[PDB]
Symmetry: D3
Amino acid sequence: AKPVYKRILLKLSGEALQGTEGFGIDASILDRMAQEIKELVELGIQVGVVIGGGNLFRGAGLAKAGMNRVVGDHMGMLATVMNGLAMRDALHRAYVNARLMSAIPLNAVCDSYSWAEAISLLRNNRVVILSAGTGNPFFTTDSAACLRGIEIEANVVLKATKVDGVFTADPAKDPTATMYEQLTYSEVLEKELKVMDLAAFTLARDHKLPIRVFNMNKPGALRRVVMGEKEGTLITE
Amino acid sequence: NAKPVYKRILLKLSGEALQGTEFGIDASILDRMAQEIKELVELGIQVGVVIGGGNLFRGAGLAKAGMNRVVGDHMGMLATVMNGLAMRDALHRAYVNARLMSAIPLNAVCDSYSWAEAISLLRNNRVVILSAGTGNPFFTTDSAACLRGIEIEANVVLKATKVDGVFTADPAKDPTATMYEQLTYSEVLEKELKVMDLAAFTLARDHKLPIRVFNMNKPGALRRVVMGEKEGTLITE
Amino acid sequence: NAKPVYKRILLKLSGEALQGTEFGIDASILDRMAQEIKELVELGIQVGVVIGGGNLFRGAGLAKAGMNRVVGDHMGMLATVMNGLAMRDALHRAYVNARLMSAIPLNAVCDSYSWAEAISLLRNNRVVILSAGTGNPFFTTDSAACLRGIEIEANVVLKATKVDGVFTADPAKDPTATMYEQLTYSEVLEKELKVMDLAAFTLARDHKLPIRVFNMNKPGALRRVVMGEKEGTLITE
Amino acid sequence: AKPVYKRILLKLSGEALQGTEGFGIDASILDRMAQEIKELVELGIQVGVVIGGGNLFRGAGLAKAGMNRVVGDHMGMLATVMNGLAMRDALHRAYVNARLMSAIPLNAVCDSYSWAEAISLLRNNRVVILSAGTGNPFFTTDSAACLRGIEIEANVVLKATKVDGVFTADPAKDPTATMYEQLTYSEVLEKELKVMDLAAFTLARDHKLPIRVFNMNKPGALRRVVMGEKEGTLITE
Amino acid sequence: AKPVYKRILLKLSGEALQGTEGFGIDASILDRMAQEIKELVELGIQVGVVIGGGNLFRGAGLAKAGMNRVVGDHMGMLATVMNGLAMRDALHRAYVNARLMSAIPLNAVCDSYSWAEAISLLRNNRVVILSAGTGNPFFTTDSAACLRGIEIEANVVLKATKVDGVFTADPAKDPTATMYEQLTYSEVLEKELKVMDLAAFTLARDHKLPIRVFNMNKPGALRRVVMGEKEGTLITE
Amino acid sequence: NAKPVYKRILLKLSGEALQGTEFGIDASILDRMAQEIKELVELGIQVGVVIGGGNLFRGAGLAKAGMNRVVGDHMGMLATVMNGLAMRDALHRAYVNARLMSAIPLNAVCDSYSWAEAISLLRNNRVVILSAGTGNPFFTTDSAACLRGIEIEANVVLKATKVDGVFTADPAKDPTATMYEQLTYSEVLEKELKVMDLAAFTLARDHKLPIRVFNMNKPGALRRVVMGEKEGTLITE
Ligand SMILES: O=c1ccn([C@@H]2O[C@H](COP(=O)(O)OP(=O)(O)O)[C@@H](O)[C@H]2O)c(=O)[nH]1
Ligand SMILES: O=c1ccn([C@@H]2O[C@H](COP(=O)(O)OP(=O)(O)O)[C@@H](O)[C@H]2O)c(=O)[nH]1
Ligand SMILES: O=c1ccn([C@@H]2O[C@H](COP(=O)(O)OP(=O)(O)O)[C@@H](O)[C@H]2O)c(=O)[nH]1
Ligand SMILES: O=c1ccn([C@@H]2O[C@H](COP(=O)(O)OP(=O)(O)O)[C@@H](O)[C@H]2O)c(=O)[nH]1
Ligand SMILES: O=c1ccn([C@@H]2O[C@H](COP(=O)(O)OP(=O)(O)O)[C@@H](O)[C@H]2O)c(=O)[nH]1
Ligand SMILES: O=c1ccn([C@@H]2O[C@H](COP(=O)(O)OP(=O)(O)O)[C@@H](O)[C@H]2O)c(=O)[nH]1
């Protein structure tokens, strides 16, 4: 009963790190994710992780408050980096070899994203955190996830969410919605389901980047997914 | 026919003063400070501005939750940049020439701190924002405020806080908390009042750098200081 | 007493359009575009220009020959810079204030892309060339053209190609290839015409960013577009 | 009889490298320090070394000659880097794994200071040289020593000096002064003894960073100190 | 019958990578050179490789077309980098440990040239590619070859050419010319033979950097040269 | 009504000429050169200035003492920057617009060398100092002086030494040492005189770049050269 993936791209949204107040970072959560990621690395899995920033800032939201869209998306990106810092530290304190790279060159705090070094690091059993997303405004860390996954030739992008997977509708606002166990792009687009930003998904589809949606707040789920069990939704075609 | 009592200042904007209820950044406070800073610039005053990050993260805070103290300060310093980004945008949208420099090289998002480049810019009547403080862990922005304040040879360091001046304690927690209106670097010590952190204080005292503590949540407060009018607490030799 | 119909544009110069017979760069086309760009600048038009690299390398091309797709796009992106270098030189030798920025930091050879710095420069009537496109593999310059076009808030993206406009096919290969003169982001799709690559197209549609496709191998073509005269194909909502 | 320290921060003043003319660097001295440092690394000790610049330049001294204080401190910092280069080379020629990092980003000659990589390097038995001090003007490499020591969580900062330790007065200008074998901050400050720049010391005290003053020109002293013998003065509290 | 060189500097001209059209890169050729370089590394040889850009651009040629000489040499340098990218990829796909460094800092695509790291990498059996030449205009990659060879203390610079070696004249335009098996600088200069740019050669002579000219299109030649056989011409004194 | 005989020059200031008795930098010589350079700038002369480091370190010197030659040149090159820092400060304190660029990127302390940026600056009547010479080991600043001199298209390279002109030997060591007042790149060779180092000399000869050697320890010497008056030795074709 060994793992069914060699290299994966873990997409961690900003919310995932949110405590109970709705903002910031919750030390306890980070530590738990570190233990889970750790188990995967021990299991011989090469882990790349793209983190979001919803717990701190979103360019759109700021833009609405009157701020320039580009600068909003910049601050939002810096936020992803601020999260990566937290994730990395947790990994380190748990004695897991990891390194933070940023699309937005941030000398001192971490090194800049380098596809070459990224791969080398991956082939050396080190967790590689890709913050600052794609580095461009008008994009979501989800795109970053798909882009970085195609780049590092990940076997699959695991989209962590506070939900067991993809439902016929929002399973928290419509007690009728049912989860899917298997899905294909054409279907997701056909029935117009919510998996992620269209651009990021279009890209994943264009390169047949399998996507799996699972719940990150469900202890063990991560492991079950990589160990090929019944967890969340699978997206391919 | 009054006219300003200062030629070039070092304005320290505390991050906490950018919250405006509930963490995050308060767009409206930002828009207001751009206006008040705009007036000073039209008034011919050169403005260097050190910004804090208390509204997002404090190294020490994170450390107690378990994070590595040094990574905590890094996140903290990165918050100042995030705040420096929003403050610059407010300036720009108010049509005020401003540039953002960071102690830790961000590149692209903003400029790296360049002492010489900062002097030139101030001379050409442009607001120079300094984020990432001193750029070293274990220090505060108050320290940077003094350090940069001396570097650019500012006439005084205006510490913009949330209260009218230096009090005998947190006026929000101790009903028995009075503020002073005059202090010598001595008195502050021979009374051990809450102004900054000895390291920064000593620095200013060392170079006979006056300090004035005032409230930025008070519209027009800054201008009054600039016009030499009864405002906040003055700290001199 | 006509005068320009645009204040600030995003000129996308395809690399292939710089060949002029046999790969490489055609000095004479370069000298000519500097002249036509010089007129627009004297005409008061702010010019941001995204340049391609089709005359030297295309990631996808190299990939089929066996190279790593990502290293291929890198080479590709580096070609755009090489083209950005020659275009800037032509501008300079024509006495036109121009600066070259790269998505991937070259430093020394040219400047790193700085959104803010780009806005300032355009405002001071200086040509801002953007090379290395989006700076990420798997994307085209057309994408960058739209991405940057939106960033600097350009009035329109002028895609400078080798043909008079968007055709039903490659007019050089399909004798049955007609071009249109008007299209809605819709029609382009509900006809599936050759304009760009959905990713870039969608982007422009998303932000109601008009696009006009014209021939740069036609001396004076650009100016006519700028003067709002029957030229190329117009793509709007 | 094994070592009593696991990780130490070696503070080497500029003078230490001075030949007999009073300036520059003396090849012979460097080589000797390299052999001693080497022995420590072989002994399993993780060594971090902060070097000064007194043998070349001091910002204050230059300032007095009329030069700007900030630029003086800059040149002085560059000097620390110039020394590090020399120290590193010596370490390399003696086949000791070492790396120079600079607070002032100096691409090519060495890499920039990165707390993360610094620690990783330390955990890999490599000597880590921290030049350019803290990177800020108005500071001494002594502060840098204390700051870098607290950061890398060094077990103790060993302050090398051309004296056996801390005396009741200058043991070279008052034949009565006696050396201390043990001291505490409060005492040093109480009797106002000379250990180092007040700021650097205040910082060390604030974080209980044990400090040991010993003679670097006394062959073997370094080893005796780390091997817990009767050498120089100890400072804790 | 083991190798007679421990560390070599392989000078690969741009032409060497040229397909049959006269320009660009030929995937097939790269792959073959990768296999040969691979054999050398397996053989315990430390390989440093300086690549040219003649297959893409030469500053002089561009200058003649009217472009600024400096910018011409810049684009030409970027070309060397574009080749290095190709060479590196080939090495990687052939599972040979290699790294591209550039004299012209090119963050992301590769790292910048660092003599220190270069040597460390060499001592670790990794191919080190030195692109962007010397980094200065008015120089040839040949100089770069000699300069980088003296720096990395290479045992010899192997100048690959599409000719078996150095002839009394051009062996392709004068069927009488004969190849030399052994030569000395004084002789090359005396009889004024074509080996490389005078500057690069003067430098090599000044430091007694043995030079060997051989044919790179002659499968096995590389190996024969390093295995001390009868191949090409030797240049020393 | 004389007026200058040059529009733009390349002033090579030897480091040794900044000692003024005993190594180090002589504040008074610095203050004097700022004045003499100030006059040239007010006189409308564009000034690019290559600075040496002979007063602090010479790679070759260190090499003989045992250091790695390459690390020696690095230290050497870093001295030029240190000298470039003090010279810029003198300029600034004399109210002369000046910028310092380094061949090896220092960032923050000064600017990276930017050919284009240097041309723009000279055109806007600002002194552009070039430190770190060519930025490569094994070369001298004299080389950089010629290399940069050609790059910026200077009218002549003024080598500022410690003696009145090119002598038949060191006038301080050989009583039988006469200087010339006219030389052809030829004579210099067909007499093998002490002007620079063939590499740099050849370079200037290559591009018909005249050279004039004069004494900077002679107040007003520079201006006389600039005014085309009997001063130093002239080296032309
Ligand atoms: O490629 C990217 C990735 C992120 N962002 C910005 O940074 C924020 C990151 O938060 P995101 O919404 O992607 O994170 P998550 O929703 O996953 O918590 C976004 O809101 C954007 O403003 C961006 O502009 N481009
Ligand atoms: O020189 C500096 C300045 C700031 N910080 C960190 O960044 C935070 C900035 O917030 P600060 O408390 O200075 O802001 P304010 O109190 O002014 O709101 C600090 O708590 C530190 O963790 C740092 O480490 N070094
Ligand atoms: O955002 C970008 C823009 C370009 N490229 C690469 O660089 C080449 C640039 O040529 P492009 O086809 O964009 O130029 P054009 O078609 O306009 O001649 C592309 O083929 C890609 O390989 C890239 O990877 N990312
Ligand atoms: O954090 C620092 C460290 C050093 N320096 C400057 O660089 C010199 C380094 O010499 P220092 O006196 O620290 O060295 P040492 O006395 O140990 O020989 C100082 O004089 C300062 O001018 C600085 O400004 N800040
Ligand atoms: O130190 C160097 C190396 C290269 N180049 C430029 O980049 C090109 C590289 O091609 P080169 O002729 O050196 O390559 P090869 O002849 O070996 O194919 C040259 O033509 C120059 O324009 C340069 O200016 N300086
Ligand atoms: O292109 C350069 C210029 C200088 N240097 C080094 O830095 C020192 C600078 O001093 P130089 O002798 O050029 O100065 P000057 O003789 O003009 O006083 C040299 O000795 C070299 O070690 C170098 O390696 N490369």
